Amino acid sequence: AATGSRVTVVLGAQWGDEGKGKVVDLLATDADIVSRCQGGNNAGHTVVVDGKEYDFHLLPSGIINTKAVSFIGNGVVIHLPGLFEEAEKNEKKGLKDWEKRLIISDRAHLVFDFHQAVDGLQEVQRQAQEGKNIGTTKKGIGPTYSSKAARTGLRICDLLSDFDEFSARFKNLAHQHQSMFPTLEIDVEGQLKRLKGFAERIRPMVRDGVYFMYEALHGPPKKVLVEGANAALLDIDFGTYPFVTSSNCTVGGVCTGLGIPPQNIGDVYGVVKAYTTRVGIGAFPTEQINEIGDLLQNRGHEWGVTTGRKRRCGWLDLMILRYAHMVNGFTALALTKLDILDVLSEIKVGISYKLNGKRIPYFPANQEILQKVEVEYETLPGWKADTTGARKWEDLPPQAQSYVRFVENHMGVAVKWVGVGKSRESMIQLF
Amino acid sequence: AATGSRVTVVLGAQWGDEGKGKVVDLLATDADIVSRCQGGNNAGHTVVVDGKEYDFHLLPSGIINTKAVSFIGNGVVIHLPGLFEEAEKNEKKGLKDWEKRLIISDRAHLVFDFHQAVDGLQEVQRQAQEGKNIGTTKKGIGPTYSSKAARTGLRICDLLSDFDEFSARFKNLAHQHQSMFPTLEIDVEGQLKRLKGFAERIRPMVRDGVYFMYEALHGPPKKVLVEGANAALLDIDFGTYPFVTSSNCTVGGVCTGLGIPPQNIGDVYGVVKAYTTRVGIGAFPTEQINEIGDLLQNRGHEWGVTTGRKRRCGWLDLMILRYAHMVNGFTALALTKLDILDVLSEIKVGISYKLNGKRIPYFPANQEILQKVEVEYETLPGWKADTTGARKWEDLPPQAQSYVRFVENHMGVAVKWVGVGKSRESMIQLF
Ligand SMILES: Nc1nc2c(ncn2[C@@H]2O[C@H](COP(=O)(O)OP(=O)(O)OP(=O)(O)O)[C@@H](O)[C@H]2O)c(=O)[nH]1
Ligand SMILES: Nc1nc2c(ncn2[C@@H]2O[C@H](COP(=O)(O)OP(=O)(O)OP(=O)(O)O)[C@@H](O)[C@H]2O)c(=O)[nH]1
Numbered sequence: 008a009a010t011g012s013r014v015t016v017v018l019g020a021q022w023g024d025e026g027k028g029k030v031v032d033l034l035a036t037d038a039d040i041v042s043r044c045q046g047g048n049n050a051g052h053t054v055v056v057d058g059k060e061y062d063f064h065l066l067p068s069g070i071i072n073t074k075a076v077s078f079i080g081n082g083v084v085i086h087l088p089g090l091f092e093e094a095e096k097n098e099k100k101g102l103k104d105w106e107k108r109l110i111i112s113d114r115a116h117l118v119f120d121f122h123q124a125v126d127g128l129q130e131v132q133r134q135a136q137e138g139k140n141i142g143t144t145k146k147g148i149g150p151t152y153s154s155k156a157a158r159t160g161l162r163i164c165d166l167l168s169d170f171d172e173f174s175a176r177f178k179n180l181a182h183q184h185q186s187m188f189p190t191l192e193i194d195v196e197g198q199l200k201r202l203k204g205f206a207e208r209i210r211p212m213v214r215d216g217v218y219f220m221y222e223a224l225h226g227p228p229k230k231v232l233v234e235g236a237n238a239a240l241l242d243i244d245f246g247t248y249p250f251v252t253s254s255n256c257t258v259g260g261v262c263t264g265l266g267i268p269p270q271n272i273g274d275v276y277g278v279v280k281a282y283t284t285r286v287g288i289g290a291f292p293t294e295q296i297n298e299i300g301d302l303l304q305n306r307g308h309e310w311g312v313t314t315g316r317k318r319r320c321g322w323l324d325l326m327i328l329r330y331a332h333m334v335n336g337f338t339a340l341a342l343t344k345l346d347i348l349d350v351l352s353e354i355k356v357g358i359s360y361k362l363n364g365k366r367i368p369y370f371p372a373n374q375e376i377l378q379k380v381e382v383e384y385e386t387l388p389g390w391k392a393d394t395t396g397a398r399k400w401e402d403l404p405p406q407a408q409s410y411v412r413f414v415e416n417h418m419g420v421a422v423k424w425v426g427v428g429k430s431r432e433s434m435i436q437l438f
Numbered sequence: 439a440a441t442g443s444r445v446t447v448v449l450g451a452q453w454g455d456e457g458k459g460k461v462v463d464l465l466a467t468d469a470d471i472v473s474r475c476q477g478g479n480n481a482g483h484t485v486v487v488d489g490k491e492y493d494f495h496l497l498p499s500g501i502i503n504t505k506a507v508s509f510i511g512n513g514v515v516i517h518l519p520g521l522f523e524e525a526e527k528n529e530k531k532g533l534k535d536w537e538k539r540l541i542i543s544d545r546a547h548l549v550f551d552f553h554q555a556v557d558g559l560q561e562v563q564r565q566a567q568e569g570k571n572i573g574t575t576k577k578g579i580g581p582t583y584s585s586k587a588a589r590t591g592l593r594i595c596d597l598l599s600d601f602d603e604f605s606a607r608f609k610n611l612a613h614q615h616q617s618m619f620p621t622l623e624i625d626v627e628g629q630l631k632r633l634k635g636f637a638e639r640i641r642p643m644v645r646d647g648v649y650f651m652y653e654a655l656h657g658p659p660k661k662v663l664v665e666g667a668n669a670a671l672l673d674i675d676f677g678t679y680p681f682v683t684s685s686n687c688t689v690g691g692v693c694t695g696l697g698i699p700p701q702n703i704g705d706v707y708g709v710v711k712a713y714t715t716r717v718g719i720g721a722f723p724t725e726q727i728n729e730i731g732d733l734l735q736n737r738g739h740e741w742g743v744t745t746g747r748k749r750r751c752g753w754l755d756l757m758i759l760r761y762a763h764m765v766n767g768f769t770a771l772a773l774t775k776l777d778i779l780d781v782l783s784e785i786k787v788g789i790s791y792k793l794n795g796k797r798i799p800y801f802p803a804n805q806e807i808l809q810k811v812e813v814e815y816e817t818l819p820g821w822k823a824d825t826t827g828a829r830k831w832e833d834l835p836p837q838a839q840s841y842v843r844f845v846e847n848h849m850g851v852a853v854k855w856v857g858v859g860k861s862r863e864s865m866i867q868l869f
Contacts, residue, residue, distance in 0.1 A: 113803050114676070141589050158572050158681075188618065260694065
């Protein structure tokens with residue numbers, strides 16, 4: 008085939024925390040290349056191997072495989088210190104020779120220190136005095152993307168090129184920022200100095216990302232895995248704007264983040280949690296602010312890993328799911344946390360939205376509208392049984408099998424994996 | 439097929455002005471839907487029908503077909519006045535009932551008046567006193583994209599929703615801009631008033647863009663045409679940054695600009711000019727600052743339609759072409775302006791780049807490097823004959839046929855069309 012190898016993609020289908028990491032780790036085992044095409048939220052990911060716990064943010068989970076190549080695409084924004092700070096932390100815990108299995112596209116944009124600063128203050132103004140919240144902060148993701156949009160930002164390739172031309176551009180950049188932000192403090196020579204140090208440290212891992220992926224996809228058959236960032240509803244274009252990240256968290260982001268054509272996209276897996284969760288303020292049609300939600304919240308341990316803030320919980324919402332599929336064209340699904348529902352007598356599933364009495368066939372773009380929809384539910388009987396031990400389709404009880412079919416049928420996408428626990432063994436592959 | 443209809447895409451393979459419009463107009467004839475997925479540069483496009491000349495910028499060329507639906511995807515940034523100003527201009531020249539054949543995704547971002555202003559001054563600072571140039575201006579494209587990145591911008595859906603919540607957000611936005619830009623003048627109540635007027639005027643043409651395209655692609659077989667903006671080397675991620683637009687001008691942009699999955703992408707045509715042209719400063723490996731370039735410049739009428747500024751001309755450059763294919767996965771090519779070369783005795787074609795003596799297999803990301811490459815040429819004999827009258831492969835002379843094969847072979851992509859003139863008849867379809 009002239010096409011060559013097609014990449015396998017894992018994307019979140021809801022508002023994140025679906026359990027993508029579990030699907031990625033399971034697939035990263037026999038993958039030749041494990042990559043990240045979009046930075047997104049740079050949310051954290053914990054991986055356990057041979058008795059060691061690792062924490063990755065910018066680094067692909069697959070960096071664990073010493074037999075695979077880890078690749079950061081051009082679509083990921085990178086903060087040098089944060090990167091090495093992350094590399095060093097995991098290294099001193101077991102990760103060895105990572106600098107020999109990590110490749111970085113030279114077209115990736117750089118998140119400078121002042122970006123994080125401009126991002127740290129914007130929040131202490133936008134929502135520091137009874138203001139509305141939006142996305143993450145102190146990471147400087149948005150600001151970096153803003154610089155990219157303005158064609159004012161700097162990339163890895165620029166850093167590794169003539170440092171004289173880089174310095175002049177960096178200064179100009181920081182200058183413009185101090186203009187738009189008078190209360191912004193920038194240790195110019197200090198940062199510029201720390202960067203030149205970073206340039207040399209990173210240079211051996213940088214390559215032309217487009218040529219690198221093209222070669223990998225057109226040489227002998229290879230297995231490339233792309234771990235999607237965040238989820239569909241957190242997508243800059245398609246998520247519940249403005250409560251979204253600054254990058255595409257959907258399938259198109261694979262093409263723009265790696266520089267590969269659509270024909271080189273193969274399996275696209277949608278990770279669907281058996282119920283819905285969301286972080287922060289915003290419309291949440293199926294939200295359950297009652298005993299059910301507390302139960303899903305508790306049994307699912309739905310709270311920020313670091314802050315401990317509880318996540319909002321609600322019933323599975325098919326309108327979100329179908330929308331995510333329209334955009335991503337999932338070829339298969341990974342239904343996770345089915346076990347959380349082991350305890351319920353009946354489970355509700357939102358099947359459609361009604362607006363001013365009438366049923367609408369689309370997922371509303373604006374918040375005000377999305378906040379007004381009336382959910383139409385379909386009550387299903389529960390299995391009232393422990394599924395944590397199931398390891399095959401036949402092990403699941405009749406009402407649980409029906410729950411899975413219900414998802415497949417209404418989404419038009421087959422379920423390939425059913426998650427019944429945290430351990431990688433607690434995953435059932437249906438085909 | 440579960441996939442449904444696959445869209446046909448036309449993309450520029452070089453630095454723009456390749457002749458995409460000719461390929462689009464030829465295809466828009468029997469297309470059910472003609473759309474734009476990314477605004478990009480909002481460059482102009484002239485179309486002639488029944489004795490009337492139209493000028494489209496935001497409006498898809500296919501709006502000419504009264505039997506087709508014109509669609510502006512979520513990836514296009516829109517300036518309301520500019521839009522109606524464009525609609526009205528063409529309407530008073532023949533375009534009638536356009537408001538009945540035009541659909542607009544409600545997820546499309548809005549280019550407000552102050553965006554254009556912040557963009558008009560940034561240029562009168564960045565390169566108004568011996569400064570370097572970059573992209574277009576006075577359009578406020580970049581600034582709009584910056585607002586998008588910050589999740590601070592407003593979209594069509596927001597405008598059509600509760601105007602009270604819109605006004606508060608608009609004011610907040612304009613406020614932030616006056617903070618970052620003290621010399622920025624904003625007639626808040628004046629603009630906010632003109633918008634409410636715009637909201638009602640545009641409301642009847644707005645729809646949920648994701649649902650609209652999904653339906654069109656999964657209902658009975660339809661023919662959707664996507665006219666790409668600008669070209670590959672003007673791509674924000676993949677073009678010769680910083681000399682590029684603020685949006686993806688490549689195939690991935692189709693997915694992110696329309697919200698359709700990769701499997702719904704069918705034919706992707708790369709428009710390749712028989713020689714290379716570029717607008718503005720920047721590295722140009724095959725540039726010919728001599729009699730050849732003057733000749734290509736003159737015979738090809740390579741100058742800005744409005745400003746009359748001459749465009750830089752050079753030999754066909756295969757490194758740019760192959761790069762564009764790595765990223766876009768062209769299924770077929772449209773080789774244009776072959777006739778411009780009718781007069782040469784021998785034609786040169788850059789086949790590879792050498793760097794510090796060695797041949798590099800990739801297209802350099804950074805300008806400084808790209809400016810240092812040494813081009814390796816392949817001299818080919820010319821046909822020295824008038825091809826403007828050719829209408830089939832057999833009409834082309836032997837050296838011209840070879841020129842076409844040379845392009846196909848070294849790009850690995852078949853040539854489907856050969857352009858030998860301005861008239862739509864001056865196009866040869868090879869298969
Ligand atoms: N009980 C149960 N827990 C699960 C299942 N699948 C995943 N989890 C847990 O859910 C939590 C979510 O972690 P991840 O798998 O990293 O999910 P995520 O997709 O990375 O979320 P973000 O990357 O932050 O968007 C982990 O603590 C998992 O152990 C499942 O089938 N059952
Ligand atoms: N002689 C000749 N002129 C051509 C040919 N194809 C296109 N042109 C002319 O080239 C010019 C370019 O116009 P378009 O076809 O709109 O090109 P473009 O792709 O829209 O460029 P941008 O949209 O600005 O990036 C027009 O004046 C065309 O008539 C060809 O085969 N031969």
